[PDB]
Amino acid sequence: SMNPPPPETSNPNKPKRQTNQLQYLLRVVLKTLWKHQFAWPFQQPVDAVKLNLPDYYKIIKTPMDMGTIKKRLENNYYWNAQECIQDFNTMFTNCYIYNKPGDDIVLMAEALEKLFLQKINELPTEE
Numbered sequence: 001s002m003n004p005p006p007p008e009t010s011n012p013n014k015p016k017r018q019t020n021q022l023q024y025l026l027r028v029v030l031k032t033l034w035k036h037q038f039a040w041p042f043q044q045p046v047d048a049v050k051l052n053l054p055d056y057y058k059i060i061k062t063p064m065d066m067g068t069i070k071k072r073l074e075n076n077y078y079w080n081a082q083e084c085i086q087d088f089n090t091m092f093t094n095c096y097i098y099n100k101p102g103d104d105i106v107l108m109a110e111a112l113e114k115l116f117l118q119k120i121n122e123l124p125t126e127e
């Protein structure tokens with residue numbers, strides 16, 4: 001039933017960088033998905049209490065959301081692009097794991113993920 005602490009967005013002893021790929025992940029990828037009409041369910045951690053989903057964090061053991069990704073990018077939390085790409089993929093995968101095909105939230109994730117794929121196809125070469 002209860003919500004877990006959200007994923008961390010700050011960790012001072014975690015090494016981090018600001019690469020051109022991570023800049024693109026913020027300025028292009030996150031920005032594109034964030035403004036989308038279907039972004040809102042994904043702009044913050046799942047509130048299992050308010051949404052009345054008491055089994056959500058029994059099923060989903062690696063939660064992720066764009067609110068978290070946004071703060072991680074703004075805070076330069078990542079070492080490399082792959083870490084951030086993995087967070088997006090975790091977010092999408094969690095949605096598909098928890099819900100059933102054709103649910104509204106799945107259609108919404110599919111729309112965002114199509115755009116995600118189109119943008120990472122154009123990920124720049126590093127440096």
Ligand SMILES: O=C1CCCN1c1cccc(NS(=O)(=O)c2cc(Br)ccc2Br)c1
Nearest residue numbers: 041042046051053094095098099104105108
């Ligand atoms: O799986 C995820 C990841 C992000 C939110 N989420 C999720 C899954 C199941 C229900 C809800 N509750 S909700 O946000 O009010 C909702 C949203 C939409 Br769109 C359609 C119906 C409902 Br009910 C949320």
